[PDB]
Design a binder for this molecule. Structure first.
Ligand SMILES: *[C@@H]1O[C@H](CO)[C@@H](O)[C@H](O)[C@H]1NC(C)=O
Ligand SMILES: *[C@@H]1O[C@H](CO)[C@@H](O)[C@H](O)[C@H]1NC(C)=O
Ligand SMILES: *[C@@H]1O[C@H](CO)[C@@H](O)[C@H](O)[C@H]1NC(C)=O
Ligand SMILES: *[C@@H]1O[C@H](CO)[C@@H](O)[C@H](O)[C@H]1NC(C)=O
Ligand SMILES: *[C@@H]1O[C@H](CO)[C@@H](O)[C@H](O)[C@H]1NC(C)=O
Ligand SMILES: *[C@@H]1O[C@H](CO)[C@@H](O)[C@H](O)[C@H]1NC(C)=O
Ligand SMILES: *[C@@H]1O[C@H](CO)[C@@H](O)[C@H](O)[C@H]1NC(C)=O
Ligand SMILES: [Mg+2]
Ligand SMILES: [Mg+2]
Ligand SMILES: [Mg+2]
Ligand SMILES: [Mg+2]
Ligand SMILES: [Mg+2]
Ligand SMILES: [Mg+2]
Ligand SMILES: [Zn+2]
Ligand SMILES: [Zn+2]
Ligand SMILES: [Zn+2]
Ligand SMILES: [Zn+2]
Lengths: 430, 441, 445, 443
């Protein structure tokens, strides 16, 4: 029952890794221990320079072979225990007990909380790569859970850990369970408890603040690298890791009416959908303030009728307007002379049948406004047409968080425009 | 089929990779081809959907196994030919001709220029990790060289390529030869030319500007990641990638009197030495203008006597001054009352601790010159906090080259240094010792 | 499930196939843990792959290394370890795992697989007797279950068992390992799996082979001496000696307090020294008989003869009584009164300094000896003028010498007093024949 | 409960006072832990008290013992160990306790107390250089704080420090202990406490001392060779050598791949090998000057002369150039064209296998060598018809004196230029010592 201790989560400027390592060596002087890091920690860790204790440096180097940064190559045992900074081994044979639990149970990971101020708690977790989203909540079947929040020793087989795509990406507590929950693995939070370091790290408030800030930065870089734009929690809290008003949109220019996320087998990033909703809400309120007649058009009306929202692989919003009302709103008249950035940062342009409103100068998610005019009972443009009774009157229809205006009898309208059954038969990307 | 074509250097927004792939497949339908990218290239490359053409995405991903991001997974032949975008296969048999050249010569790498506007040139390259420097120059034994500049097809054994730490780090033209030259491997530039693509990529000024901006950013990040702080051409045309007046110094706060770079088995970053030279020259200029008697002290004097420069693993500069001259210098007078940022960004501080003065390069970069005031008492220079020495060593001072200018040193400075440090200190440098440092701490 | 560290110990630095060995295992598993152990850093360089799972363990002390750096168990983190000799190659995949599975399913603590060299391992029986400094090998009665192996094999066992031995990696490992496991009652199961031989085997030339065999023979002799094996025997009767001879010193050095050093080590007289004592006793008796000197077995030599016709197994010399008036008959004895004499066979004869007796030494260098005690009849009672402070040194009635009787001793027939039971009880006490004890029980019993 | 274990390692089986030593400590505290350590069972018998707190530790492999039996830490259950030499005696009660109090309150890893023998311990400075294979001793400038002790002292340190060393009990302990602790930068503090001497001191006769010293110097020589200490010096002098010489092979033997064995050891050239190289160079230069052969320092020899007046400390030969037209002046050189020549002082002169140069080896057995490269002017350029880059003749018109290896050699004029032509700009100022990591990568 040989288990390698692997230490990955610590701060070079303030850690208790020498105590952690010394505590395991007091129980077994030949205990295999691997401390992993991206660069050589400074100030020096000053680990014991004995063969069973090794520092694994994970970044590339001009003077090292490929194997030197592959952590599986430092681990020879069947099992591996991930130990966070702040833990120490006090009683003996605790790794042995965790191994027995793993072999007895049905969960590929077992875990023991560390008696810190934040000992690990069970969590439910779903990961939807298609929607770039990870959803956390309370774990119904605890102590069997999908993920942990807080400090714990996690033990699993080395062949399971190191066949993951990113086994030691930081923060481990986020990165590991995103990968294992996606594979359908469970973690059993055992009743065993590891003691805290007798001299804990981050004792001052300044040190904790510094560490929390570095940790938030690592978590944000991790989620961006792995395609998680949104972390949501049971109870409503949202964590965003995508585009915003001062960045570019996530996918950039489209070619052939197929954005890049479709070729990645994903749908629209949720931050982009959020920016579209708020631009739809903004434009609609501007149009209504100026007394401009508008209705939902094209795919936006289709999504409104289907689920009251933007079709989740769509990437813009379409509204129709009465051409004779264009003069009623200041931004449109401005848009005819040139680009107009208004007081809220939105960008209105004509560019030349329609108008386009972009979320911001940098973020080019947009709403298109298509002007129609009644020529003789049918609405028509000049660069397909439809009867004007569909606009007399217009009906309320929930869309993108607010109440939009839609053609009356819009299901009939939508089957006119797209064919029979379009609401019930979405054209899923493949 | 013994060679796998591997395409790493191209841009998603403007490339000729489809023509490249097609050109090799027209010569052999079964030719193994791997296009490597960090993420899925957009717009779609639309490569042929055949078993011998694979798109390798090297970034880690939540739904992929470890092997998916390891490039050797995608290659099953003895050799790899790195092919830059813009090249095209025209004459058949070029790859197998390059294999024959490799087997018969002594170079680990063989290369063929691509007939673009920037065809590959043979280069010398010396890589010193201790001094964080990559020194390029003209190749004395061309067409045997250490590195190439420009477009070439590069063939080598897959075993050799994928044993490197960063075999496909971009730019390949830079990271490959940094790694192979450090190992002492040669590349042989053959008398063979690959043709250029018939529709070349990046054919507009705007497209090339975009590509060059992105390539420069990738190179700067690569050199920092690998610890190359200085790149030179024939000892000149310096390109810096380290610290400067507006940043922190490279190694930050020193703990235990041993800076971080010694644990990394290296010497002082050359950007830090450059800043130390500039600060010493500036301080000496100020002290002489104000009429302040100074001399090189400690390891600065030792370095000056040894080779006229800072000892290349030291990280500061020490000068002695006459205490009664302190009042002559505005900055030193100001430093007694508090920290002073002068006209040119240098920070002058009075040590309340050890009773010396410290001049820092900038507010953010704490590379420093230390100033040690002494005062005579019965012919012996002494101070009140802590070795004292006879005053006659200062009567007179003598000129001594140091750090690119002429400094002042005690007369008989070899005797001076020997009394301070021991006999033979000038001839017997205390070279850094990683093994010992690993043992003592 | 099973993790096995490959550990290489048996190779020559001047000529070996370790690179091929290690590379063959890396071809089956790139992260395969491999430990090469050596006493000093091999030159020319081994040039192993400088990868974290391949390590060089140096078993030498060094000024800049902790104690752990030369203890090989700190390099092995796995449950199991496989000792692999140079000249072997990993060819079939998963052989180590099949070995782990056989060990777990069997009852032996060691399992082994031959290597397809010109000398593949073979099953042997082995008895070790430290008290008699002897190792006895024979044919395996219950093959493929053995006590020892002869020849090349991969040997797999638990790290905790290997590294709890006193000298786990002493060379030659093929000798050293099974001396330690057989003494503990452990068995090695010879499995029906075969590792392939190296494609470019080491020691390809006759000259390189010949230098390797002599270096190995020197290491084996050093190992056996270090561990106190003086004699190795094989079924068929063949003997290898590793102690005394006519041309060296005797094994133990000067004896204080009647108790030689080996008895405090809980061992008996080395077999090297006993053989020489028998050769010297046989020779001296022949000289005295040919010279017409009446002699009889004395002291511990007579007691050993009465018990089992041989030297007592913990004694270190031989004693004979002679008639003083016969001394002049023997050329060596006449010479010995004038000084030290080295005779026709290299035996050394001297008249001692202590107490009016003669001593015959096996050689000039080897001081195993026969002591000759001259007696003369006073009035029917044998006597001498100077006495040693032993309870065994007394007068005795001449009728015990009239006549002498034959009695086997040390491989030949010797002359003994008649009624030698009563003779022995008179000088040692009642029941001496039936109650063996060490030369002086107040110190060691 | 006691917190120090007395440990005895330095004694001779044939003549010791270890029974008196043990008894004296047990008299102060009958429970005092005592370990006597030896490589084999001491004979004649020590006959130590048969009590649980007195133990004999035999540090020898044995067929019937567990690995732990030969590991000294196995025998020590206390925080501290006191190494006590034979000839010492415990009289004043509570001396070990004062030593523990001294160690805890000071900043030295080791504390020591002299034993009042005829050779009481003295405080010494010691610098250990593994790269130069040298131990330099001297007077201790900051006594009572030392790097090392000479003479008889009880030494106390933590068990975890002592048994963490590679060779904690290697003999003689007085040498091996402080080589290990001084290398680590640990201090020993010589306390103002004295242990008494044994009432019946061991080794009381001249003959007994003679035997003890003979085996002790044998142990020291084997210890220093095993640990890679080739040279011991006192105050820079009184050299004591433990390497190669005129009668032996050179330390690193045959060089494969132009990389001598000492580089893989992460060390530089052994000092005995450098000493023989200086002697051979001085001799060869003396011969060539007497015979009228023009020569000059060449290659790395010139580089070492220009940099610090000596052989570069990780180089292992010496290179000189000569005028080919002058070779006939020297008898040894003339003989070398016919075959190998062992001259009157044992040096071996040979004309190269292939490569047209001459080689002078230190002796028939020791192959440290000086190479001579003959050049000849072909219109103002020096050239050898075999290939040491060709160079212009004016660098030798005239030659200049240059200190090298303890004597004055001839160098090309403007040797700074000369070296930069052959090695590249700034070569004198940019020495780069061996890089073992780079050696481990490239081979
Ligand atoms: C043992 O020595 C090594 C130095 O080689 C050091 O790293 C380690 O911490 C030491 N251990 C103890 C317990 O002193
Ligand atoms: C995860 O998926 C299940 C459906 O399989 C769902 O009911 C559950 O609520 C999801 N978990 C979270 C935390 O949203
Ligand atoms: C992945 O799993 C397989 C099968 O368990 C194993 O052979 C391989 O070593 C694993 N990869 C690792 C540990 O990197
Ligand atoms: C990989 O590179 C290392 C040098 O760091 C070398 O030791 C090893 O042999 C190389 N492996 C192969 C297969 O070339
Ligand atoms: C080993 O001892 C056993 C036990 O008496 C005996 O049966 C066997 O004959 C001996 N074998 C050898 C080879 O001496
Ligand atoms: C000796 O065996 C024990 C168990 O019996 C084990 O814990 C220990 O690691 C072993 N020691 C060595 C040095 O292998
Ligand atoms: C030891 O080294 C120091 C510093 O290098 C030096 O001052 C001292 O003289 C040296 N001592 C001896 C005995 O060599
Ligand atoms: Mg702390
Ligand atoms: Mg659109
Ligand atoms: Mg300083
Ligand atoms: Mg007898
Ligand atoms: Mg006797
Ligand atoms: Mg040479
Ligand atoms: Zn977005
Ligand atoms: Zn810098
Ligand atoms: Zn014997
Ligand atoms: Zn030498």
């Amino acid at each position: 029952p040989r288990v390698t201790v692997l230490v990955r989560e610590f701060e070079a400027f303030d850690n208790a890794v020498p105590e952690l390592v010394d505590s395991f060596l007091q129980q077994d002087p030949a205990q295999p221990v691997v401390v992993a890091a991206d660069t050589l920690p400074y100030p020096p860790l000053a680990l014991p320079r004995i063969p069973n204790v090794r520092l694994a440096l994970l970044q590339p180097a001009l003077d090292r072979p490929a194997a030197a940064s592959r952590p599986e190559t430092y681990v020879a045992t069947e099992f591996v225990a991930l130990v966070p900074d702040g833990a120490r081994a006090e009683a003996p044979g605790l790794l042995e007990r965790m191994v027995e639990a793993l072999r007895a149970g049905s969960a590929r990971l077992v875990a023991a909380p560390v008696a810190t101020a934040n000992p690990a708690r069970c969590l439910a977790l779903n990961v939807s790569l298609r929607e770039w989203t990870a959803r956390y909540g309370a774990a119904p079947a605890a102590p069997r859970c999908d993920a942990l929040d807080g400090d714990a020793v996690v033990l699993l087989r080395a062949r399971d850990l190191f066949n993951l795509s990113a086994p030691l990406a930081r923060p481990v507590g986020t990165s590991l369970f995103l990968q294992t929950a996606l594979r359908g693995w469970a973690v059993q939070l055992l009743d065993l408890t590891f003691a805290a370091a007798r001299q804990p790290p981050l004792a001052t408030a300044h040190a904790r603040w510094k560490a929390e800030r570095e940790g938030r930065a690592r978590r944000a870089a991790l989620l961006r690298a792995l395609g998680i734009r949104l972390v949501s929690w049971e109870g409503g809290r949202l964590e965003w890791f995508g585009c915003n008003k001062e960045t570019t949109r996530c996918f950039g220019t489209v070619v052939g009416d197929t954005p890049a996320y479709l070729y990645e087998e994903r749908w629209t990033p949720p931050c982009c959908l959020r920016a579209l909703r708020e631009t739809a809400r903004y434009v609609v309120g501007v149009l209504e303030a100026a007394g401009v007649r508008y209705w939902l058009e094209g795919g936006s009306l289709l999504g409104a009728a289907r689920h009251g929202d933007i079709i989740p692989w769509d990437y813009d919003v379409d509204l129709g307007i009465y051409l004779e009302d264009v003069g009623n709103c200041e931004q449109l008249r401005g848009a005819e002379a040139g680009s107009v950035v208004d007081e809220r940062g939105f960008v209105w342009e004509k560019a030349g049948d329609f108008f386009r409103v972009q979320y911001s100068e940098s973020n080019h998610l947009h709403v298109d406004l298509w002007p129609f005019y009644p020529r003789n009972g049918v609405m028509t443009k000049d660069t397909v047409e439809f009867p004007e009774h569909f606009l007399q009157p217009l009906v309320p229809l929930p869309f993108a968080g607010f109440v939009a205006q839609a053609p009356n009898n819009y299901r009939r309208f939508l089957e006119l425009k797209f064919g029979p059954g379009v609401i019930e038969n979405p054209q899923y990307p493949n």
